[model samples]
Target: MEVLFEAKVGDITLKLAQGDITQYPAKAIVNAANKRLEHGGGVAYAIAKACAGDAGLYTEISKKAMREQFGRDYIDHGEVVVTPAMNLEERGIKYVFHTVGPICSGMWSEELKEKLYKAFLGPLEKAEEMGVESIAFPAVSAGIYGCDLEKVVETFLEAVKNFKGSAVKEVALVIYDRKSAEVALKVFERSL
Candidate 1:
């Protein structure tokens, strides 16, 4: 875990660091989840394994929120869902923002660009609504989804760069490996 890059977003301090998202200190951390909202693979798996201990519990909360409150069946691709962090709360995390991105099989295009962008933005907006100050995000869609690192950097940074609100004062891009951290650091330096 290392601080690879840092930049300013309004009054917020944006960090591009290398570490497990679960261990990344913040009020919340995003899960690169799918429509089902299970912690099956990637960041979701790690967080699910460490969190509430029952991955099904996550699915129930996420799905129930959409079904009972919003009248939806699934979270849908490119959507964001928020729920209690449960076991993670002991670590100071209050909530988990489950954000979904498009599957990697689809060819890259404007559609994917918009999907990835919304996936990150959903959590930011949710945090603002919940009055959260700090949040961490993974490189959603960059892993199993097959999105390129450059695309992930551009889309993820775009959401953070243009965010407009006061509640969220800090954001962290907590990556899992040195290679991805290098990519985020390079583009972050160029962008800032």
Candidate 2:
């Protein structure tokens, strides 16, 4: 993990770094998922592939989690389904918080912004309820989902900043590539 920045958000420690979300050692990690919990592409696929041997097999697990919680085949925006981390269990991660962010298209709207913020906020709120001490997240909606990197980063930090008293003392923003990491780091830099 290449940590780029660290700051305090209330009593919580907020970290920004460049690395694979799968390898992040936290109590739980957030998956940038779709409504179906299909680990078909991007960070979702990587987490599924790492957690279970096959992405297809892992996808079934994700779907079953949603079914157990919502009794549905798909989850709605801002909803989070908690599932076991499977192979990631050995890495000290016990749960995966699967959340769906807005698939931004055309122009950015206030509605989309609210959805994106919820996607970042849901996991942290759930972690508090579950007593998870730490959690990590990828840049939700910033990649193939098409949200701007800076907007995504700012939204993520904003969510963390606004999340009140919690058992989760640590939150890490794990970015996948150096180029994107650079962009995200700048956002952190600007805030400082």
Best by TM-score: 2
Candidate 2 Cα misplacement greater than 4 A, ranges: none
Each candidate's root-mean-square deviation in Å? 1.7, 1.0
Q: Which stretches in model 1 have alpha-carbon errors above 4 Å?
A: none
Clash count in backbone of candidate 2 = 0
Worst 10 residues of 1 by lDDT: 69-78
Quote each prediction's TM-score.
0.92, 0.97
Q: Which tens-of-lDDT digit does each residue in 83-115 have in candidate 1?
A: 778888988898888888887563588988888
lDDT of 2 by residue, 43-144 (tens): 899999999988999899989889989999998777899989999999999999999999985347888889999999999999998999999999999878
> Model 1: number of clashes?
1
Candidate 2 global lDDT: 0.90
TM-score of model 2 relative to the true fold? Answer: 0.97
